[PDB]
Symmetry: C3
Subunit: 236 residues, 3 copies
């Protein structure tokens, strides 16, 4: 499960590398490989934090549309389920994760970036919810993740139009956390990730878990899970 996606470990941190030139367009196979990569990263104790990276040229132009056009409805349905499984798995990695975004983050590419805990972006990057340009809509929970950061009205403007927005606008909207020169994206992402290597890993995992649940779970379930995680940490 690693023709296009690889996990590269180095000095306590790992890079999940998507490499499917020239746009890192994600086919069904790429999504399966992201699922396996996310699982591997969660369990590896030589890895304390993760950088998501497509290479210096591009993060991802999104779904592979030509593949999609060859599928029938049940195959497309399965593709949509694996897409969500991939995006969720990346979001749930029990370690701090940063998207090192270069070139373009479009459609499912933007959704993938939004699954990371933080995003460091090149100042030349173009973003966009391009799915509507194919007569489709964003999958993998993209519209939900977008909406919680920018609000409904802006979410609709971006998704309905499918327009490109620059890194400066992404920064102003809160969709990326830092903007740097194109040659420094990966190195800045690595530096952000390294900031957490000396933290208690189970506590980070627990904090991430509760934070991510804030918009997902009903209040009683949120409280039960927070308390359980707190007591666990305490009992260890």
């Amino acid at each position: 499960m690693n023709e296009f996606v690889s996990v590269v470990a180095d000095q306590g941190l790992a890079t999940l590398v998507v490499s499917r030139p020239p746009t890192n367009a994600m086919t069904r196979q790429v999504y399966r490989e992201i699922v396996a990569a996310a699982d591997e990263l969660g369990r590896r104790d030589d890895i304390g934090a993760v950088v998501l990276f497509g290479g210096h040229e591009i993060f991802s132009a999104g779904d592979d549309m030509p593949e999609l056009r060859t599928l029938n409805a049940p195959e497309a349905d399965t593709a949509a389920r694996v897409r969500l499984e991939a995006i969720d798995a990346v979001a749930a990695i029990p370690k701090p994760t940063v998207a090192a975004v270069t070139g373009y983050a479009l459609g499912a590419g933007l959704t993938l970036a939004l699954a990371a805990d933080w995003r460091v972006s090149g100042d030349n990057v173009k973003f966009g919810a391009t799915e509507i340009l194919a007569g489709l809509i964003p999958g993998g929970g993209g519209m939900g993740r977008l909406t919680r950061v920018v609000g409904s009205s802006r979410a609709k403007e971006l998704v309905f139009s499918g327009r490109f927005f620059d890194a400066e606008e992404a920064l102003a909207l809160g969709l990326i956390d830092d903007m740097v020169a194109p040659d420094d994206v990966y190195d800045s992402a690595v530096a952000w990730a390294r900031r957490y290597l000396e933290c208690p890993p189970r506590a980070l995992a627990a904090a991430k878990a509760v934070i991510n649940d804030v918009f997902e779970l009903e209040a009683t379930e949120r409280a039960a899970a927070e308390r359980r995680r707190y007591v666990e940490l305490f009992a260890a």
Copy 2:
């Protein structure tokens, strides 16, 4: 029939509330908004919608002389039809823009928030005025306000009932653009026309999923997103 109209022109409709002098909305006005919102969803001569109260005023909100005379079961019914009207407008499966002039107060602000976007006159006054009559905002107003501005600001506005100007509304994210009073309707029409050439079934599905973000539990949200995605995809293969 009586206070709310749908006026279609060049592919676009204006949903017009007209109940002088303040476009105060009674129970009847809300029922008429529900009928107008359903009509607008069904009509294929209509690709996008502008909500409009006329050049003078959008709406001062609930009709307080009516509300003040109701008992608890009548208030229950009033609260339902108000919510039904706001949600109907919110669910219109087409891009919708509020062309806000004069005032958007109480249920009037809520109605404006039910549009996808708001273009406001620079002289408009906004406010959650319900508490000035001893009441609270209905129609899910407090939720829609809170999700845009956060709890602390939502409370300050709703507890005080104070008026705020269009500059503050813009800074709070409660409106999307501010223009001269005489240009509000025309600018609203121009924002609405920007989407007339989009794929209508995809827009409808996108709008539906975005609106469901705060309305459905996570499993139901993911299922509905996938179903809509697959329907769009199958339809385009077929013809």
Copy 3:
């Protein structure tokens, strides 16, 4: 009784936490916060509340030395009473303002966030410090932090446990006003007094619905909003 005090003055009450030198909250302080908050909610002669730890400090958070003497089931019970205290303050059916001086750290930051508004000294340090003890914020802190600042910033703050100043809190939306250290209490009082002549039933119902926005599932929200709205028309409540 021992660490938490209620002081009333023409419609305005101050809930005072005093457990020097840091107003660290032990299990007993949380029980006392619960009882004081409930009392304040009941009292119809009180139209608003200021939360205050004195001129020097709001709270440095959980009493960690107490916590280190507990076993896991006791810690579980401690965690439930912590939540009960935060929620009790959040649910006070009257406008409430936190007069934050000195430090608001860990459960102390959570407590300030339970108030409707926060007026802070410009020299105050804030922080989600629980991770520095190998723990995580309790009392629903992470949820309350996340709704204001968003996930990405919530994580940065909670994962690091770093201190942030009043200027950064203001820019993040975590406090509503920043004033000189000597003016915190007075400004909190003036803010609270602005609402003393509002219709109390309507404030209560509005506060309850606004707080439920992130607490209840959508069908439960619509039902509870409608119930509270209709109550304003009920025979005994007009």
